[PDB]
Design a protein around this ligand. Structure first.
Ligand code: AJ9
Ligand code: AJ9
Ligand code: 9YU
Ligand code: NAG
Ligand code: NAG
Ligand code: NAG
Lengths: 535, 537
């Protein structure tokens, strides 16, 4: 019995497992329950803290993945499968994982808490790209990740009802944050230094913890990779959430009154709800998700935009960034003329039709404004430009410009902000070249996977992964991603509204740039809302 | 006769003329100045279409410039060369329908391609007798026959009560047409080729040229056309019948008048200077680059809006040279946009930029005005006074000239015409406006006419050589419909503008350089998006 592998937390005793990372062992505690299984009558309800257990609970394997839609676009293709559940699905899924150096840290160690993405309808903390061993073994970090309910089980909401108040998936994350405060110090973690980080919907989640007071006493710094609480997809209004839930109920026979309706839904097998999750969207679209956080006036006292516009963020530090090609991944999911298999060279008509699917809320005049802005009028009909502009419309509307707005409002209201753009395309990537650096393919580098020799990355990429892990961990330690040992003269400067400085992350050394899509995001952030408004 | 110069006596349809032998730097040229081509449009003829001049008896002396058409005189900067050079340099009078002819001396042997100049001045000012429209350099150095005509401006030229008989509108354009007919019948008596007539003009003169392209009766009077910094399409060159009737009725009221007949009859009793003194009071909004009395869309001269005509016209037999100067808008800011002056750097604030945009784009709704400010803002330096100043100029210049011209080039090109486009980027070493204005509106003219060749005008040697190149381009285009020199192949070639390639050339002290895209991004905003945004808002 290994003593480094035995931990006592407030609920009982855990047994971890020793894992070999490239440079040495690490202690892993996988599958720790942090809440009562949200099953039967607990479906759609806020989580409850886990009850104590007897004996030694075995924490040496990943637990189940929260029940969720499983993608089928390209069956068997690594590029999509790598995001699919790699364990059994189950509503009984509220578990978390802790990686730690081996032996356990001698000093209290800053903690990183990963919140996975997946559009609030999918995702799991057990995916290979979220493997926490490299960060713990190389940087000596204590790394935590939790499962949280997705889709109908995490965010179906009859606002104001007692039986489905919405946002329970975010309340799952919050309970895991509360768990870290109460237990992490038993693993050697420092609960007074907790950094959240996440990507896509995980990044947005991080942002809502920034914007929700009860969460603010549970972390000290945040990282939002390719996602924001503001923007067009991360939240919905009480009304639109009430609409979609009532429609999903109709589609499954409920009701044959809020309590009446939610009771019948708790009767249905999980897959019956998943079967119809995608049929409640008001328009044909990409980058829109049926069940996402709701503006309930509770977890979110107002819209994310209103909250970032007025909040005080003085004692907060944030690292925010985007990938080079945010939108490419999504075109193959609904925009006619796109495929991972051909080069997706589109006509102009295809480009206009595609803009209605990328900006599904846009009016006639507003889609025209978008088309005229992204058209290259020296080659207005070149298909290569047209496809590339299609990807930029989607990525700019859903990620880049939302990020630039958040970064600007945070910096202006006291926060200390650092911004990046990630421009390296993995040598291992299996999507076609035309997709560039797609949404989500910086993650494998920040977690250090290239340091695994069997994965067949390039020597340059291994050196690159280490640099990224230093930025992230250095940010967790200090709030500043710059190395207190490297006194070479390319320093990552803070993003400000004045200079708007950000850095390029790629194989070459840090390069400092100014203006994050400044002109084009002026269009999205400043003009387009006044347009759609006056219509 | 008997003891006068036999090379200076000519007969035209209306009688005999005596011209004058002028000195150009390279030799003598024949000038026939102040030839009347119409009955004086005075008295009961004010606002009426012109009539042919009645033949005279004896030898009409044609050695001096005749009257300038009655017009507003500029006073923003009294005695300053930048404004005085454009002011009237002969007596103001309603009796002003005269034209001028320059030819080589002795007059040419073979029939010679003809150039007709139509001055600008916003349709409220101008004269064919200004120093910068001097034909003696084109005539002497290129051997061209050059003709320029006065036309009625302001109320006398363009006040209209559309549909009435006593003020049908556009008589100023009919004045120009009557001169074009005069050239058809008489230019052979000077050695000019009536079958090779090229029009060229600038600002409102360029737009005039564009209007003759679009009016069917004019089209049988010329063969080629050059439009410098001006277009018949665009926000300022025309007004609807409704606007024109409203402005004419308002000016009448402002001068004591009072049924169209009685109302026009009253205007005809007013002193010319009373009309001029109230011209500017009829503009619907605080504006720059708007002019009270301009050509009206009458359904006669202009069968429809210029936009509709250039959109649906056959131009496969047309050859046009069109271009702009580097800083079309800067000149106009100091005539209305608070914060701007010729005597300081005009560094303005973001608030002055927003107020200035409402003035340069006087028709924009609040949303359309916001779109303009969002487009032209430098979001990395959104409060930089220098960028805001240069963006104010870009707004006015792009809205009024560069994108109207860009739209015109693309339409004519798509519909059969042969088009050549340029941007004129050289600032005269003699310019008296401040540096920040760059290359202002209308400051390529003195180079096209070849003033730099006048040794007393203190230009540089390169400026002299440059003006020769420009004269070579214009005349070659007149001779052949192609500005390129047939023999000289070493020089870089000036390609036609096309929709596929959108090629144009820069004209400056350096050799011809070819560029693609006539401010393509920004003009898509002006020409494609803004019209639909104002259609809603
Ligand atoms: C990622 C994603 C998926 C999977 C999707 C599925 C169906 C649909 O209709 C739209 C969609 O949009 C998306 O962006
Ligand atoms: C050139 C020009 C003049 C002289 C002008 C006069 C009065 C006015 O009101 C606006 C004006 O705008 C102009 O663009
Ligand atoms: C040049 O930067 C424009 C900055 O836009 C500010 C937002 O307002 C504009 C709103 O109008 C709609 C735009 O119409 C389409 C034509 O525009 C092309 C602009 O393409 C610039 C790309 O870099
Ligand atoms: C790419 O493939 C898809 C499906 O195979 C097809 O629908 C699409 O039209 C193709 N792309 C082009 C540009 O033809
Ligand atoms: C320039 O002068 C004008 C008039 O004198 C004034 O209104 C303007 O504010 C001045 N601008 C600067 C930058 O000095
Ligand atoms: C040219 O320069 C001379 C001397 O510098 C001056 O006397 C003359 O007036 C100038 N003429 C012009 C047109 O600038």
């Amino acid at each position: 019995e290994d003593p480094q592998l035995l931990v006592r937390v407030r609920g009982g005793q855990l047994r971890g497992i020793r894992l070999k990372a490239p440079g040495g062992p690490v202690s892993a505690f996988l599958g720790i329950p942090f809440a009562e299984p949200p099953v039967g009558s607990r479906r759609f309800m806020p989580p409850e803290p886990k009850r104590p257990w007897s004996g030694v609970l075995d924490a040496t394997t990943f637990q189940n993945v929260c029940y969720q839609y499983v993608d089928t676009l390209y069956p068997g293709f690594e590029g999509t499968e790598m995001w699919n559940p790699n364990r059994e699905l189950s509503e009984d899924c509220l578990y978390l994982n802790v990686w730690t150096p081996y032996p356990r840290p001698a000093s209290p160690t800053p903690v990183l808490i990963w919140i996975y993405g997946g559009g609030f309808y999918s995702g799991a903390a057990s995916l290979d790209v979220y493997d926490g061993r490299f960060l713990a073994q190389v940087e000596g970090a204590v790394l935590v990740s939790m499962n949280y309910r997705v889709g109908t089980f995490g965010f179906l909401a009859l606002p104001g009802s007692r039986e489905a108040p919405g946002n329970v998936g975010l309340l799952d994350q919050r309970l895991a944050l509360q768990w870290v405060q109460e237990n992490i110090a038993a693993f050697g973690g420092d609960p007074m230094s907790v950094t959240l980080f996440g990507e896509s919907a995980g990044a947005a989640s991080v942002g809502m913890h920034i914007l929700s007071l009860p969460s603010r006493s549970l972390f000290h710094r945040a990282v939002l990779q390719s996602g924001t609480p503001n923007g067009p997809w991360a939240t919905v209004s009480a009304g639109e959430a009430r609409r979609r839930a009532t429609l999903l109920a109709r589609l499954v026979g409920c009701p044959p009154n809020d309590t009446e309706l939610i009771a019948c839904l708790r009767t249905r097998p999980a897959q019956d709800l998943v079967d119809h999750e995608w049929h409640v969207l008001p328009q044909e679209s990409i980058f829109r998700f049926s069940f996402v956080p709701v503006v309930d006036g509770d977890f979110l006292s107002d819209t994310p935009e209103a909250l970032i516009n007025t909040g005080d963020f003085q004692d907060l530090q944030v690292l925010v960034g985007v990938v080079k090609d945010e939108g490419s991944y999504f075109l193959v999911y609904g925009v006619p003329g796109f495929s991972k298999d051909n080069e997706s060279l589109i006509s102009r008509a295809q480009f206009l039709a595609g803009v209605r699917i990328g900006v599904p809320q846009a009016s006639d005049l507003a889609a025209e404004a978008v088309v005229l802005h992204y058209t290259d009028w020296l080659h207005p009909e070149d298909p290569t430009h047209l496809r590339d502009a299609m990807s930029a419309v989607v990525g700019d509307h859903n990620v880049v410009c939302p990020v630039a707005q958040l970064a600007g409002r945070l910096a202006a209201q006291g926060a200390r902000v650092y911004a990046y753009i990630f421009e390296h395309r993995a040598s291992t990537l299996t999507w076609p070249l035309w997709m560039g650096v797609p949404h989500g393919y910086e993650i494998e580098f920040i977690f250090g996977l290239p340091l695994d020799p069997s994965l067949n990355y390039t020597t340059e990429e291994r050196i690159f992964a280490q640099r990224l892990m230093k930025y992230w961990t250095n940010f967790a330690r200090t709030g500043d991603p710059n190395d207190p040992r490297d006194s070479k003269s390319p320093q990552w400067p803070p993003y400000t509204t004045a200079a708007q400085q950000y850095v390029s992350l790629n194989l070459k050394p840090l390069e400092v740039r100014r203006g994050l899509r400044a002109q084009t995001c002026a269009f999205w952030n400043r003009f387009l809302p006044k347009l759609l408004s006056a219509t």
